[PDB]
Amino acid sequence: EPRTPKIQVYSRHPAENGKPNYLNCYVYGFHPPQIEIDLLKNGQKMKTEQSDLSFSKDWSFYLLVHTDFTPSTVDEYSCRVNHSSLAAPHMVKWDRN
């Protein structure tokens, strides 16, 4: 029985347009552990770094994916997750608010 991932997309620091920042996607609570995660800019895959896969009795499996980014007034950023508990990949949009 799979357990569906939960997905948090956030910037390391409060967003200001045109200032460099870090974009993060934390996904957790899932089983089985095989999972695919990307960060997207306007629907296109960004180059990212991905933490070590880890397990906790309180969180099941969890992973953090992150990259540099510079928010603007028009550019959209999202996290895309594919996992066997899902019928198709899910995307969560970064919301600066």
Numbering used by the authors: 1 to 97
Give the published text.
We also determined the structure of monomer bat β2m without MHC I. And the key residues binding to α1α2 domains and α3 domain of the Ptal-N*01:01 heavy chain are highly conserved in human and bat β2m.
Major histocompatibility complex (MHC) class I molecules (MHC I) present antigen peptides to the surface of antigen presenting cells (APCs) to active T cells through interaction with T-cell receptors (TCRs), which play pivotal roles in antiviral defense. In this study, we screened bat MHC I Ptal-N*01:01–binding peptides from different bat-borne viruses (HeV, EBOV, MERS-CoV, and H17N10) and determined the structures of bat MHC class I complexed with these viral peptides. The overall structures of Ptal-N*01:01 display the common characteristics of classical MHC I molecules in other mammals, with the extracellular region of the heavy chain folding into three different domains.
